[PDB]
Amino acid sequence: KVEEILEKALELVIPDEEEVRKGREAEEELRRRLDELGVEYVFVGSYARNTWLKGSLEIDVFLLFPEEFSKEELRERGLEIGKAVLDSYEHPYVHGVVKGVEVDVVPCYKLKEPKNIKSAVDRTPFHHKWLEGRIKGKENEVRLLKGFLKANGIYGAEYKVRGFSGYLCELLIVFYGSFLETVKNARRWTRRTVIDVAKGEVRKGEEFFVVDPVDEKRNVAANLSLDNLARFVHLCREFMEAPSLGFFKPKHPLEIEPERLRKIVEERGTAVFAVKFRKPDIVDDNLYPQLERASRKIFEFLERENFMPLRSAFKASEEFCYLLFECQIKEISRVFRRMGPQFEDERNVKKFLSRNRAFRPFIENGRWWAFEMRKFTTPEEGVRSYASTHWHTLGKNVGESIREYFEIISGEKLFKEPVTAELCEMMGVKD
Ligand SMILES: Nc1ccn([C@@H]2O[C@H](COP(=O)(O)OP(=O)(O)OP(=O)(O)O)[C@@H](O)[C@H]2O)c(=O)n1
Ligand SMILES: [Mg+2]
Ligand SMILES: [Mg+2]
């Protein structure tokens, strides 16, 4: 059964004649442009090992340079070989297109093996060398892994996904031999599982760690979040229990009507709202970590102010960002208890009592307390206040945007914004 499912899964993960066509054209051409210049380079991507997922074609070329320091020559070479170009940020590289195919031209040292100068980009060539000879023949196993992860939103080590990188997928296929064996054993991974590829061993450690065979101190699964690891383990246990081709297919967007959402929310009886603001002009890897931090600070504020947040989420559209929240408390009393000093402190007590208040302070369990008034009674009002004077804690660029402008939105108005998918997921809505 399973083998039959994996067989049909291949038709979803293995590229196609018309994209294996573009990659074969752009490659020859790129070599021609690189050779004429007499450049030293090496293709090192998923493309270079035919392990790239269907529809995800892209080429990675690393230019090799000695022991000198400013490879602004790369800026030069790339621009001179790529039909179109862009500078993506020791991180600046050329990204463009050649014969229609996306290409990355990156600056590294033709290092006579492991040492890596201010390593990062310099490791990429060894990663390729280490894999090239071990992955041969299992290309499609890698593809099944990638396709499986992707269909479930966990392929990609970028901050927006915090999932499994392509490289991590190839080390795993190499360690276990195949996609199936990988999932079968991933059913027993724990948050303390250490997969040491170079030593062919699995042990227990401090956190989930997949030792890079090229550099033992590096955790290849550094960006995989604890929760996406958990989801993969659970997915594996589910697939083996009942394999289905559906695990290799994107789930379909819960086409939900605003009136059905209003009904779910009034039925849950919670306060559902979002903070809307202009999306700052920064790259995803910079934006997402700020959206996560801004969402956590606001959640912590809601917890502290006793609005009992249930869950939060965020969304980045083309022009705006949204921080979504759901709280168990829609309204809290205007009066609250303010803690005073122990009865023994004559001086501080006199001070605590000198303040004018609508009600009389009192002693309880040896300490003075006073009833005082809150400056807001709903989580929406609480957040309007917080976002107005504590935007500095919400990330450098996200906070600056909120400082210029933001609005708290709820109800139908909220349902009209492009955040319905996030809302449904946040509340666990099902079809
Ligand atoms: N040690 C490294 C460092 C970087 N890359 C590059 O980092 C990006 C991740 O790619 P890879 O790990 O090869 O997998 P994907 O490119 O995601 O492959 P696919 O989209 O086809 O699934 C790629 O452009 C790849 O060229 C790599 O392969 N190995
Ligand atoms: Mg690639
Ligand atoms: Mg790339």
Q: How far is CA 23 from CA 20, 48, 214, in A?
A: 5, 10, 28
Experimental method: X-ray
Q: How far is CA 137 from CA 27, 124, 202, 273, in A?
A: 21, 21, 24, 51
Q: Where in the chain is the domain with CATH 3.30.70.590?
A: 254-333+378-431
254-333+378-431: which CATH number, 3.40.50.2020, 3.30.70.590, 3.10.150.10, 3.40.47.10? 3.30.70.590
Where in the chain are all domains bearing CATH 3.30.70.1550?
Answer: 334-377
Identity of the amino acid at 137: G
Mode of pairing for the β-strands spanning 209-211 and 367-373: unpaired
CA-142 nearest atom, ligand 1: 22
166 lines ligand 1 (CB under 6 A): yes
Mutate to test the pocket of ligand 1, among 60, 116, 124, 149 (most ligand atoms within 8 A of CB): 60
* 3-state SS, residue 189: coil
- Where are the domain boundaries for CATH 1.10.1410.30 in the chain? 1-14+138-253
Query: How many other C-beta atoms lie within 10 A of the C-beta of residue 225?
Result: 15
> Is ligand 1 within 6 A of the CB of residue 232?
no
Does the domain at 1-14+138-253 match CATH 1.10.1410.30? Answer given as yes
Tell me the structure's resolution in angstroms, rounded to a single decimal.
2.0
Quick one: fold of 15-137?
Answer: Beta Polymerase; domain 2 (3.30.460)
- Alpha carbon nearest to ligand 1 atom 26, residue: 45
Among 65, 293, 41, smallest CA distance to 159 is for 293
Q: Among all chains, which residue has been given the structure tokens 């392929």?
A: 155
State the alpha helices, DSSP H only, in 59-123: 72-79
The DSSP call for residue 82 is -
The segment(s) of the chain belonging to CATH 3.30.460.10 are 15-137
Distance 328 CA to ligand 2 centre (A): 45
Closest atom of ligand 1 relative to the 53 alpha carbon: 21
167 lines ligand 1 (CB under 6 A): yes
Question: Is the CB of 29 within 6 Å of ligand 1?
Answer: no
Q: Per the CATH hierarchy, to which homologous superfamily does domain 334-377 belong?
A: Archaeal tRNA CCA-adding enzyme catalytic domain (3.30.70.1550)
CA distance 115 to 136: 26
* Cα separation values, 230 from 114, 132, 178, 180, 316, Å: 33, 30, 21, 18, 25
